[PDB]
Amino acid sequence: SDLLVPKLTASVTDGAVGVTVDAPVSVTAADGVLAAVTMVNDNGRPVAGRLSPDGLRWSTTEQLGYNRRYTLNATALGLGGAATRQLTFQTSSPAHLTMPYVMPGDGEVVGVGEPVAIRFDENIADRGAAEKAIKITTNPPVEGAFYWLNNREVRWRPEHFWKPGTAVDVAVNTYGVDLGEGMFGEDNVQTHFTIGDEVIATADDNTKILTVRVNGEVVKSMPTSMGKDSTPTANGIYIVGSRYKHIIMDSSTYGVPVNSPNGYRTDVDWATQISYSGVFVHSAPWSVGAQGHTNTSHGCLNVSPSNAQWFYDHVKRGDIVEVVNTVGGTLPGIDGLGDWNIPWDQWRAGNAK
Numbered sequence: 208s209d210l211l212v213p214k215l216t217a218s219v220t221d222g223a224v225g226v227t228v229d230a231p232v233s234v235t236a237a238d239g240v241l242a243a244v245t246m247v248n249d250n251g252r253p254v255a256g257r258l259s260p261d262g263l264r265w266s267t268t269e270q271l272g273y274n275r276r277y278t279l280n281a282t283a284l285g286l287g288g289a290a291t292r293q294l295t296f297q298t299s300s301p302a303h304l305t306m307p308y309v310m311p312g313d314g315e316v317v318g319v320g321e322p323v324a325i326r327f328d329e330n331i332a333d334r335g336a337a338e339k340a341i342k343i344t345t346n347p348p349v350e351g352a353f354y355w356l357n358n359r360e361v362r363w364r365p366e367h368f369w370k371p372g373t374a375v376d377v378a379v380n381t382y383g384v385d386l387g388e389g390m391f392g393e394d395n396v397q398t399h400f401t402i403g404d405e406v407i408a409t410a411d412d413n414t415k416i417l418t419v420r421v422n423g424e425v426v427k428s429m430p431t432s433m434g435k436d437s438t439p440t441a442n443g444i445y446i447v448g449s450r451y452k453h454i455i456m457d458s459s460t461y462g463v464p465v466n467s468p469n470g471y472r473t474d475v476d477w478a479t480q481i482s483y484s485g486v487f488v489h490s491a492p493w494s495v496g497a498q499g500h501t502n503t504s505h506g507c508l509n510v511s512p513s514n515a516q517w518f519y520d521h522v523k524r525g526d527i528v529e530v531v532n533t534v535g536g537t538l539p540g541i542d543g544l545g546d547w548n549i550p551w552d553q554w555r556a557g558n559a560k
């Protein structure tokens with residue numbers, strides 16, 4: 208048997224540029240074991256690594272940085288000689304960075320209508336890469352798809368409402384990923400949430416009653432006053448959002464001056480958001496005589512203080528409100544909480560462009 212000679216294999220090539228940092232760097236020995244492996248950046252600072260017990264694999268154990276020039280030295284020893292290699296490579300230098308933000312929060316329990324939300328703080332030129340970098344796990348597994356509400360936020364939901372008890376895991380692995388036009392991910396995100404009870408509240412303009420159903424059983428019937436004809440509440444499916452014991456409604460947040468005929472600024476109690484456009488379920492003492500009879504608001508579902516607080520107490524983010532038989536149209540699918548009004552075939556087809 209003649210002298211066999213160890214060989215070295217690295218996941219980077221000497222002289223390479225634009226190396227993406229979305230993966231560790233590794234060195235592998237063949238016909239021999241690794242005796243020494245070091246990796247330092249342009250300033251001489253070492254990079255954390257781990258050699259496998261069998262001595263055949265060394266990998267970086269920490270995140271690698273943008274705009275860095277790394278130098279790698281590896282020595283492989285064997286029964287028939289040795290082999291050494293020095294490799295230098297330069298990582299990606301982004302033109303701009305973008306940090307994602309994921310809802311719902313880690314560990315939260317949400318209703319059957321809560322979609323996965325990934326919001327970036329910059330415009331995403333390559334939506335496809337963003338979608339490819341986002342891995343969603345569901346238990347029991349269910350089909351879902353991506354759909355963008357605007358140039359910075361994407362959503363992921365199944366065809367129908369979640370089944371209660373479903374576990375969802377979200378891993379936004381955007382670090383080191385070219386998201387288009389030199390826009391690279393600033394970090395990764397990992398969120399996990401669970402689907403709770405089915406809570407569907409239906410507001411019928413014919414009866415002017417807001418009926419809350421938990422697991423299919425009617426548990427509360429609230430006389431309500433919705434948007435008047437000139438500013439009606441839109442029919443469709445609303446996703447419950449944030450909740451406030453009290454909040455100052457200010458029309459100027461939507462570009463409508465407070466000092467207008469259609470502007471407003473008032474403080475209200477027990478407000479539950481259900482649309483970005485400003486539809487809330489809140490306490491309306493000034494309209495109890497109208498609640499259950501005639502509509503008098505700008506879209507908000509007015510109810511009594513008792514029922515408003517009840518809604519605040521018994522409804523959670525992700526629960527569903529459905530408005531039907533109003534003089535208005537359908538809530539826009541891209542409102543922010545109207546995801547379910549987009550027909551499944553359009554949502555499934557996505558808009559990655």
Ligand SMILES: *[C@@H]1CC(=O)N(c2cc(S(C)(=O)=O)ccc2F)C1=O
Pocket residue numbers: 456458461463469484485486487504505506507508
């Ligand atoms: C709750 C009280 C109310 O009627 N709205 C509301 C306002 C508007 S807007 C910004 O004037 O067009 C749209 C829909 C609404 F429900 C509240 O904010």
Ligand SMILES: [Cl-]
Pocket residue numbers: 244245246254255256257
């Ligand atoms: Cl090392």
Ligand SMILES: [Cl-]
Pocket residue numbers: 328
């Ligand atoms: Cl932000």
Ligand SMILES: [Cl-]
Pocket residue numbers: 435436501502503
């Ligand atoms: Cl009216």
Ligand SMILES: [Cl-]
Pocket residue numbers: 455456457458460
């Ligand atoms: Cl507001």
Ligand code: NA
Pocket residue numbers: 209210
């Ligand atoms: Na020989």
Ligand code: NA
Pocket residue numbers: 471473
């Ligand atoms: Na008002």
